[model samples]
Target: KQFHTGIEIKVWAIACFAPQRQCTEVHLKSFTEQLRKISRDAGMPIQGQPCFCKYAQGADSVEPMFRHLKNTYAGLQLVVVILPGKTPVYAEVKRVGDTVLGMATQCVQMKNVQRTTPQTLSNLCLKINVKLGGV
Candidate 1:
């Protein structure tokens, strides 16, 4: 399905805020940049640069952090969260991003972020476009 909105022409840059324990700085940076690169190939260009940050683990850090994050009006456009495997933080991220603040967020594992492929990136772009379209 092709996205049609010549005037709206969806475009945005992403920001990362993941647990420091789970993510590799190098990989986190690379994944966001790779997503940026593929977004361009997919027709939605990532404007400016992707901002990156690391936070402490668990559910506690996620909601309030995202709450204040929403409050700050970072113009983040979208948030790319790097998650640890099988953690509650994922649910918290969704809670804050979806119902709590109505912010756009896309979450991925470090494994996927660490190593990327074109096909997978295509999948990534599709998911993000779905999220970004609404918010």
Candidate 2:
């Protein structure tokens, strides 16, 4: 007889956008640093050695990267996307991952956005906690 455990398998990843028209490298770096801290504190630590967080050139780059992630990682559960604007990437990620792959995804907008302050990081942490099923 096989017993079924009621545990759900979960894994996390992150993606950040910095189109030339939108953000600077400095901003992306800082944002990533803050993201690491916030996610860690929230108890949903994003994978680091494998470096799940990535930067895409534009909306066009979203799919291939996601496909690569899905293939490379065995059990990818959640993807935290940092969008630069109302681009097609967001919709595409949802369509392909949520609609097709059945993976959980969340987006954080960064258009016309500046630095990631402590309060902002905390707010993001709260959202991430909820997303990852934490109280």
Candidate 3:
């Protein structure tokens, strides 16, 4: 019998708050669906028992959520989406985890990136594939 030593990867998307704009439940759901489809198509399947997608209040929430995730999941690969004016949380996510925890963190801006559009989703898929080391 052959055993599989392949790595188990989990994908998480965190949306932080902004004074003017924020992601609604519909946006999050659409984003998750497109992300999963794109990732799987690019050969990076985001699989886990519970879906890893989440939302946070502000930049302050970034560290705690990341800390909890690091402690909870072993082979975690995080992909963060920063809505307009949420750069602080993006920075926190990259600084707190990438170097210290040796986890890969990819950040993308939500500007003009609509989950509802197939073209936009395809473009995002290309970028995400590169970020995740996929072809």
Candidate 4:
């Protein structure tokens, strides 16, 4: 237990994979906003908005997308992938972000974004902070 958990997602990306018209800008924007508030309350405030945010639909595209992000954003500290549900994209996102690229990642279920709450955002920040080097 610590007073100020300093780790946070400084420069990150937010991408989502959902069938056409499922996850919208509103959902992604809302989730990102909530994330900042929750993290700030926890003493790990994110520096600013994510550096990159995009939306697409495909399981196989995760790897290449991650590779591109790593190449493009040198300081890309973390990636937040919003999954539609229990899909294979989760595995690919994890494989690349964890094993291949060695970057931190946090997955937000689509439902949580569309139907967000402080409690849910707090939990997500917990995971993000740990991966971002918080103890």
Best by TM-score: 4
lDDT of each: 0.65, 0.65, 0.56, 0.80
Instruction: lDDT winner between 3 and 4, please give it.
Output: 4
Order the numbered candidates by TM-score, best leading.
4, 1, 2, 3
Minimum summed lDDT over a 10-residue window in model 3 is located at 1-10
Candidate 1 similarity to native, TM-score: 0.79
Model 3 pairs whose backbones collide: none
TM-score of each: 0.79, 0.66, 0.65, 0.90
List where candidate 4 sits over 4 angstroms from the true fold.
1-4
Tens digit of lDDT per residue, candidate 2, span 15-113? Answer: 777453566656656676676766665555654332476677666777788888888887777777778767888888888777776667778778423
Every candidate's CA RMSD: 3.3, 6.6, 5.9, 1.8
Best by lDDT: 4
Error of 2 at 56 (Å): 3.0
- What is the per-residue lDDT of model 1 for residues 36-104, given as tens digits with 9 covering 90 to 100? 777776677664355436555677877766766666656667777777677887888888888888877
- Candidate 4 lDDT over residue span 7-116, tens digit each: 75678898888653787787777778877887887888875588888887787889888888999998888888889889999898888888998877888888998888
User: lDDT, candidate 3, residue 125?
Assistant: 55
TM-score between model 2 and native: 0.66
